[PDB]
Write a protein that binds this ligand. Structure first.
Ligand code: HEM
Ligand code: VI4
Ligand code: VI4
Length: 390
């Protein structure tokens, strides 16, 4: 059986595309959407999504992407030569295992109480910078600054570049102009290469550790590609999870807000389920013809999965935050081989940032909220609040 045709917003703009994406999951478990003049398959039924994420015949190597998707400014049209270096999310099999293993030998000994106390020290400083200022946009004043400040110190980037990097990735991930996206992607690659080949303006951190001393040798090219990947993924979605968690707390009476360590952990989990920063993740390609739920996915087919629809049943709807659910059964970090490597980091930062704000402004309220989203990324750009007093 062939998958029927539905419609998702493919270009980013100032709207919340959530009702359009959940409406396309109602078409069929597998659907075909118009994308870049051709079509793309998407899995929408939750269990069918969970099997697609693990499918042995759905690969992600850059040798499989057809030419009509390799457009400059987009991820698939921005990869390097796979023989020189591959990014972790776009490798398969033993290639992926080596890249993932080398990334996990970084920063030994990794103690999360150390990671967290530094997350806490930065959350306090931005809460103070906030208190040093009646409506407040907590997105631009809090949720944006925290994950950026940590990943820069963790990577060891020079403090001068931190103010400029937010504006570069903003274009790569949310602009609707392809030339601007092609320029911002090249600007990041050219800056990363300058830092790796000449590590003088860098602080000791992750990057200098990859350029250090048998079988765990990281080439200069892999150091650049992996650093680029970690700048693209290292803070943007973490800030979207922080703001999304705060939105659901600020909109409720202070009594219904989490206070315990357990309720804060369950709160950030339910925010991941309801507001996936990646409503659809990265691309996969059928190495053989596949049937999923009676629907055909032909060979070489580009396939995506509806994480926003897999996180909900047929009953929920776009606004379905339930503190009792605690995000049980969400697929927002992926599953299996390519499960998010920075999931523990994004959780601990979301948990610390959400608790830090609620302990500092116990009488905060929302009192509008604007989104920026496409079918593959979703974020709040203002969350206007009224903070009250400490
Ligand atoms: C809450 C924020 C985050 C979300 C929602 C998120 C989501 C995801 C998802 C869905 C994937 C899998 C994509 C797929 O299978 O198609 C993924 C993979 C990945 N994420 Fe995250 N992520 C987050 C935070 C981070 C952070 C902070 C880092 C880096 C520190 C990071 C680095 C990665 C990497 C490297 C991969 C690729 C893993 C692999 O293929 O082996 N992510 N992320
Ligand atoms: C990932 C890509 O990197 C950019 N790129 C340059 C950007 C600026 C200057 C030179 C290149 C350059 C070169 C080459 C490749 C290449 C070979 C195989 C597969 C992908 C490749 N990409 C190459 C590439 C080979 N010899 C070169 O000089 C283009 C951009 N469309 C983006 O898709
Ligand atoms: C707008 C969002 O980001 C876009 N994106 C690029 C857009 C342009 C150039 C490079 C990338 C790029 C890269 C990577 C990821 C990635 C890794 C894990 C999970 C999600 C990810 N998204 C990545 C990504 C890793 N290394 C990269 O170069 C793709 C788009 N589908 C959407 O996810």
């Amino acid at each position: 059986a062939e998958a029927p045709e539905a419609h998702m917003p493919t270009d980013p703009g100032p709207f919340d595309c959530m009702p359009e994406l959940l409406a396309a999951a109602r078409v069929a478990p597998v659907v075909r959407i118009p994308y870049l003049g051709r079509h793309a398959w998407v899995v929408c039924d939750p269990e069918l999504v969970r099997t697609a994420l693990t499918h042995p015949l759905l690969a992600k190597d850059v040798t499989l992407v057809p030419d009509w998707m390799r457009k400059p400014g987009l991820m698939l049209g921005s990869q390097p030569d796979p023989e020189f270096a591959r990014t972790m999310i776009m490798s398969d099999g033993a290639h992926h295992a080596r890249i993932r293993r080398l990334h996990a030998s970084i920063l030994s000994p990794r103690n999360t109480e150390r990671w967290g106390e530094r997350v806490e020290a930065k959350v306090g400083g931005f809460l103070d910078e906030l208190e040093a200022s009646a409506e407040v946009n907590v997105v631009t004043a809090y949720t944006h600054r925290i994950p950026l400040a940590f990943i820069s110190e963790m990577l060891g980037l020079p403090l001068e570049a931190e103010r400029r990097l937010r504006s570069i990735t903003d274009v790569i991930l949310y602009s609707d102009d392809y030339p601007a996206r092609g320029a911002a992607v090249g600007a990041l690659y050219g800056a990363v290469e300058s830092w790796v080949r000449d590590p003088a303006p860098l602080r000791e951190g992750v990057i200098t550790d990859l350029l250090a001393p048998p079988e765990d040798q990281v080439t200069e090219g892999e150091a650049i590609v992996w650093t680029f990947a970690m700048i693209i993924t290292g803070y943007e979605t973490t800030g979207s999870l922080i703001s999304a968690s705060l939105f659901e707390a600020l909109r409720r009476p202070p009594e219904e807000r989490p206070r315990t360590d357990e309720e804060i952990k369950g709160w950030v989990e339910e925010a991941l389920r309801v507001h996936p920063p990646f409503p659809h993740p990265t691309w996969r390609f059928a190495t053989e013809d596949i049937d999923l739920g009676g629907y055909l996915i032909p060979e070489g087919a580009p396939v995506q999965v509806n994480l926003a629809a897999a996180n909900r049943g047929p009953e929920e709807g776009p606004d379905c935050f339930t503190p009792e659910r605690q995000g049980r059964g969400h697929l927002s970090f992926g599953l299996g081989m390519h499960y998010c490597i920075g999931a523990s980091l994004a959780r601990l930062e979301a948990q610390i940032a959400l608790r830090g704000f609620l302990r500092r402004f116990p009488e905060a309220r929302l009192s509008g909220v604007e989104w920026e989203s496409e079918w593959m990324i979703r974020r709040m750009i203002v969350l206007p609040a009224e903070v009250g007093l400490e």
